[PDB]
Amino acid sequence: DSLAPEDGSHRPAAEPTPPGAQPTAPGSLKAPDTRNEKLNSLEDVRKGSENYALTTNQGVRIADDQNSLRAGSRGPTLLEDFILREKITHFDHERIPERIVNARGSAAHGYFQPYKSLSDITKADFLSDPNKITPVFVRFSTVQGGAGSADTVRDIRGFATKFYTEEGIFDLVGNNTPIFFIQDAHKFPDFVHAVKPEPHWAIPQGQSAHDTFWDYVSLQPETLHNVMWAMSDRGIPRSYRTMEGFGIHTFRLINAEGKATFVRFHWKPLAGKASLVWDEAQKLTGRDPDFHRRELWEAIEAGDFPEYELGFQLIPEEDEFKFDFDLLDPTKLIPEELVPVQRVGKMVLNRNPDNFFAENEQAAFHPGHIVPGLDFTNDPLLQGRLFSYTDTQISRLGGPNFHEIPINRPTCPYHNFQRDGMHRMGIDTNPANYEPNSINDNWPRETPPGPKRGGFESYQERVEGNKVRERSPSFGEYYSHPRLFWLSQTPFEQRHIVDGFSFELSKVVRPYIRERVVDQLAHIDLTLAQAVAKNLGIELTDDQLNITPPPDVNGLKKDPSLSLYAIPDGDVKGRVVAILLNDEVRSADLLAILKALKAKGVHAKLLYSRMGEVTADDGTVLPIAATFAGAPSLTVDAVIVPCGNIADIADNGDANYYLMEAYKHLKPIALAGDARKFKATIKIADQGEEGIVEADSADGSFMDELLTLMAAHRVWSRIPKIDKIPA
């Protein structure tokens, strides 16, 4: 109809722009030049739209897409309207089953590149040449909730990477915590059923705060390690860009000589580690249930590409038994103070998808998708995972040919004797559909193992024992890793952990379940146990108070790599600041604030009590991003209030509340000139306090103080001060 506005304002600029600045859009419309080989091979299935006639699926042009065919304009719909019928039919079949676990996820395209050849330890082609680029597709996710639940729940996050190598798809399907809850895959369905919504009423969504989770945990102490991690701030990351990633299981690297090495896979966030605080995370599920999805997407459109360093913990075959814990036990971490992570390569995520359904929702990852140069181990959880995935994927995607869906295909077409199945797209021409054959001179052919481009051979690990359904006795230790984790956290991290356990156990209706969790916490650490106990109105028995603590892990009293914050790794590029305007902002302060933010790659959003524009003292017209209520403090990393007619907003409940919520959630607050009248709102002494930047104006110094606070992410020293303000 030519409904677009005459001005071109409906379509974003195909260049990197700041979050909130332009309508977001499909990846290849937004960043047409961001390319790689996999992204280039997808061009054959991308479809355009502009300037085409509207058609049926069979190519017939549609004249009237507003009406059904009927006998009279007020008469009955006629069965012969095939156009109406195809439209409703497709719509009626849009949905597919969501993943059993990790149904909520957000994904992006990018590339990986190794720093140096790793040929001495692995013949994996993607690790052999630093001038070589392997396209990747990453999907991050939550675990428990549906595809439509909230992003910022407390939970473990999945972190799956598909590597389209030259010798096959390698999928590195890991999580954001280095261990899992259970030891043997046989218990996956019991554990997952316990954390998922309870069967009689399907409640609660996206939460482990319910009886069944804690019943299970209280009966299966192998779970306490990963439960500590989830109860901590690790359970509620600030963003997918600011969390670690782990393969979890011990795998094998295999070189050209046949030497096998043990490896654990790590991803280090180049943006540093950072998480929200519980009240903030919970509230954020209400105000913006898509916060992680949006943030990841907008980060990529702004050019703040999520960057991660692939790292390896390497353990020679001869040191297999040299630890306190079993290397093949997935509830056990390998302390970096014992086995350091070696830097291997870098992954950059620089393009969003075009169609979430087509690329994200249909993407299929599998930990069994390994390439020559890698191999498994006998880890019993990994071993049972090797059976799931493909199984579930055919159910979910419609057939065994789901490897032909565009996102899932290798960069080089495969050749084998597999035929038919639902929705077969390739048309095979080989005369032979079996091997060995003589009618196609045996093609395609087997390829011996070799140093490069050889066929897949499993490592000839020795196998010895009886056929038994038995847990290895070396896996029977459950409290020493949870304790190592506990001792490595800072004091404010310990309290957050205490509050995580306290909050969750309080949603457990059956009191005895709470008491049993407390009993288990008393086997990890007495100080942890007493503080949780106290929050539940429980007193430990004398016996509980004398439980002897678990042994150290290989003599360690702590390991600082396990804390999010003990060792500062801050980075503010990509963070965002809220700027509370008034109806006559001193433009001098605004100019100084925005330019300083911009120099460090920090984003800003101009907020007011209404939408539209406000005009600064010199006549500068300032466009408003969102209102105070519309873009709450939960969504920003810090707040700045410029001088101006402060009386315009000083009595605005939403304005004041904005600073109270941000102060409560430990965020840096900066007040310029008369904005300092808000100090009374958050009870700040005349003197001032650490975490509150204030001055007569927003000069250079003022912005450097604010940015330094931003580099340390939150104002932990404010904790005792927040207790009292009602917010």
Site for ligand HEM in 374-393 (CB under 6 A): 381, 384-385, 388-389, 392-393
* Residue 152 per-residue DSSP state: T
Q: How far is the CB of 216 from ligand HEM (least distance, A)?
A: 15
Q: Which does 395 bind (CB under 5 to 8 A by kind): a second copy, ligand HEM, none?
A: a second copy
Q: Which is nearer to ligand HEM, 96 or 219 (CB)?
A: 96
Q: How far is the CB of 396 from ligand HEM (least distance, A)?
A: 5
Q: Which residues contact 84 (CB under 8 A, 6 or more apart)?
A: 68, 69, 77
Q: Scanning residues 131 to 160, which ones bind ligand HEM (CB under 6 A)?
A: 139, 141, 158, 160
396 binds ligand HEM (CB under 6 A): yes
Q: Which is nearer to a second copy, 85 or 343 (CB)?
A: 85
Rounded-to-integer distance, Cα 306 and Cα 106, Å = 13
Residue from 187, 224, 195, 216 nearest 384 by CA: 187
> What x/- string results for residues 246 through 285 when contact with ligand HEM is judged by CB under 6 A?
--xx------------------------------------
Q: Which is nearer to a second copy, 312 or 663 (CB)?
A: 663
87 binds ligand HEM (CB under 6 A): no
Q: How far is the CB of 76 from a second copy (least distance, A)?
A: 5
Q: Is the dihedral of CA 224, 230, 231, 233 positive or negative?
A: positive
Q: Which is nearer to a second copy, 75 or 448 (CB)?
A: 75
DSSP string, 388-422: TTHHHHHHHHSSTTGGGSGGGS-SS----S----T
24 binds ligand HEM (CB under 6 A): no
Q: How far is the CB of 193 from ligand HEM (least distance, A)?
A: 12
Q: Tokens 């001792």 sit at which residue?
A: 487
Q: Which does 66 bind (CB under 5 to 8 A by kind): a second copy, ligand HEM, none?
A: a second copy
Q: Which listed residue (4, 13, 78, 88) binds ligand HEM by CB under 6 A?
A: 88
Q: Which residues contact 330 (CB under 8 A, 6 or more apart)?
A: 179, 180, 182, 183, 248, 249, 379, 380, 381, 382
Cis previous bond, 189, omega within 30: no
Rounded to the nearest angstrom, the gap between the alpha carbon of residue 262 and the centroid of all alpha carbons in its chain is 26
Q: Which does 74 bind (CB under 5 to 8 A by kind): ligand HEM, a second copy, none?
A: a second copy
Q: Which listed residue (228, 253, 364, 703) binds ligand HEM by CB under 6 A?
A: 364
Cis previous bond, 436, omega within 30: yes
**Helix-helix angle 480-488:224-231, to 10 degrees:** 20
| 3-state secondary structure at position 223 | helix
Q: Which is nearer to a second copy, 25 or 314 (CB)?
A: 25
Q: Which residues contact 352 (CB under 8 A, 6 or more apart)?
A: 26, 27, 30, 108, 109, 297, 300, 301
Q: 650 is written with which tokens?
A: 């000083």
Q: 602 is written with which tokens?
A: 């920090």
Q: Which is nearer to ligand HEM, 393 or 480 (CB)?
A: 393
Pairing outcome for strands 603-608 and 576-580: parallel
Q: How far is the CB of 229 from ligand HEM (least distance, A)?
A: 12
Q: How far is the CB of 677 from a second copy (least distance, A)?
A: 14
Using CB under 6 A as the binding criterion, the count of chain residues that bind ligand HEM stands at: 31
Q: Which listed residue (31, 39, 83, 101) binds ligand HEM by CB under 6 A?
A: 101
Q: Which is nearer to a second copy, 27 or 691 (CB)?
A: 27
| 3-state secondary structure at position 704 | helix
Q: Which does 13 bind (CB under 5 to 8 A by kind): a second copy, ligand HEM, none?
A: none
Q: Scanning residues 158 to 197, which ones bind ligand HEM (CB under 6 A)?
A: 158, 160, 173-175, 180, 185, 188
Cβ 470 vs Cβ 486: under 8 Å: no
Q: How many CB atoms lie within 10 A of CB 450?
A: 12
Q: Which is nearer to a second copy, 358 or 547 (CB)?
A: 358
The residues that touch ligand HEM, with contacts defined as CB under 6 A, are 88, 92, 99-102, 105, 139, 141, 158, 160, 173-175, 180, 185, 188, 248-249, 330, 363-365, 381, 384-385, 388-389, 392-393, 396
